[PDB]
């Protein structure tokens, strides 16, 4: 009755943690400047009509 972990699940794990930390660090960091009224930027982009606008 021996046990062993596959590899198809390993790759996912490693990436799961990596992405978690990556998005975390960046998220917590960008959460410092994002504190400002996000509506401000929304008004700019809307006028820029570069992404889903026009």
UniProtKB/Swiss-Prot annotation:
The chain crosses the membrane at residues 8-30. It comes from the Eukaryota. Ubiquitously expressed. Isoform 2 is also expressed in ovarian cancers. It is found in: Cell membrane; Endoplasmic reticulum membrane; Golgi apparatus membrane; Nucleus membrane. Changing residue 50 to A: Strongly reduced phosphorylation. Phosphorylated on Tyr residues in response to EGF. Dephosphorylation by PTPRJ prevents endocytosis and stabilizes the receptor at the plasma membrane. Dephosphorylated by PTPN1 and PTPN2. Changing residue 51 to A: Reduced autophosphorylation. It is linked to Lung cancer: A common malignancy affecting tissues of the lung. The most common form of lung cancer is non-small cell lung cancer (NSCLC) that can be divided into 3 major histologic subtypes: squamous cell carcinoma, adenocarcinoma, and large cell lung cancer. NSCLC is often diagnosed at an advanced stage and has a poor prognosis. Neonatal nephrocutaneous inflammatory syndrome: An autosomal recessive disorder characterized by intrauterine growth retardation, premature birth, fragile skin, recurrent skin infections and sepsis, failure to thrive, nephrocalcinosis, and nephromegaly with tubular dysfunction. Some patients have chronic diarrhea, and necrotizing enterocolitis. Belongs to the protein kinase superfamily. Tyr protein kinase family. EGF receptor subfamily. This is Epidermal growth factor receptor. The chain holds residues 642 to 690 of 1210 of the full protein.
């Amino acid at each position: 009755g021996s046990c062993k972990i596959p590899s198809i699940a390993t790759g996912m794990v490693g990436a799961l943690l990596l992405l978690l930390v990556v998005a975390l660090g960046i998220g917590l960091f960008m959460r410092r400047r994002h504190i400002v009224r996000k509506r401000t930027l929304r008004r700019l982009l809307q006028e820029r009509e570069l992404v889903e606008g026009g």
